[PDB]
């Protein structure tokens, strides 16, 4: 592998681990990762923190009720860019009508950009990801991988 | 005031903030602040973050019972280095007899490097500075703003 290859893997290995962790624990988590759309204008709504991913810091983020958990994680150029960030809520007919805010703001925000988002849920610990408008629920971890691994 | 010292006063509103929350919650706390004893092989040891200082990033990461509430926290000028990191225990008979290790630890750093560590007490929220090998406990608000400033 290349120096690049080898630092795209060791990212989507620190992500997979967050989201298993959270899973596991039905802890509620947003994070969108920017693509050739840019999204600085979500981004500057957030906390800035231009940090190293690790999946710890991932999973320190999304604590419940804590300072940077009430938003979106945007993800930019193999960063964390910031904490709480807004995303659009999406007004599509055709999300489940069981899901909430989180699955809404990532079905909302892939409706503008070519961004991949993954939601959490704190209902049910199911793992989600919005792309192009559209919601894929209830992943497995090989198929988040495959996905990831895709984008 | 030059943009170093408005970013100066930026990190030190920050840190004071986050202490502040964590002294009234029982938050248990450990953050080293390098000076010019350059800390690298300790901020070596811990999670690299190299993000950019927010009172709520601070927070979040010593949250308990979180990856990375254990350990120091060591910030560089205007970053959060690293997180969960070890620092070397001190066997001064100046550290009250009921202190823990994150005191020790403090302590510890504080004699082999100029750096400032700021520490929150889990049993009591009292906040206390090491430095120079010495232990000054139970500061205000006010007394740690001030030797922030003045560091
Ligand atoms: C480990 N953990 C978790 O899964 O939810 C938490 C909440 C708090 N406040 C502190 C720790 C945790
Ligand atoms: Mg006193």
Known sequence: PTP??????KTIEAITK?????????????????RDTGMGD????????????????????????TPLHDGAVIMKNNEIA????????????????????????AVGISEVTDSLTIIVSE????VSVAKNGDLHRE???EALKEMLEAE
Not at 18 to 34: Q, V
Not at 123 to 126: F, M
């Open 139 to 141: 992943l497995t971890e």
């Open 82 to 105: 910031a904490a709480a960030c807004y995303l659009p809520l999406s007004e599509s007919p055709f999300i489940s009508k069981e899901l909430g805010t989180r699955h809404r703001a």
């Open 4 to 9: 690049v290859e080898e630092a795209q893997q």
């Open 123 to 126: 209902e049910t610990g199911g």
């Open 42 to 65: 979500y981004i500057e709504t957030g906390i800035p923190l231009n940090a190293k991913v690790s999946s710890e810091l991932l999973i320190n983020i999304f604590i419940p009720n």
């Open 18 to 34: 967050a989201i298993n962790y959270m899973a596991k624990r039905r802890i509620g988590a947003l994070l969108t990762i920017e």
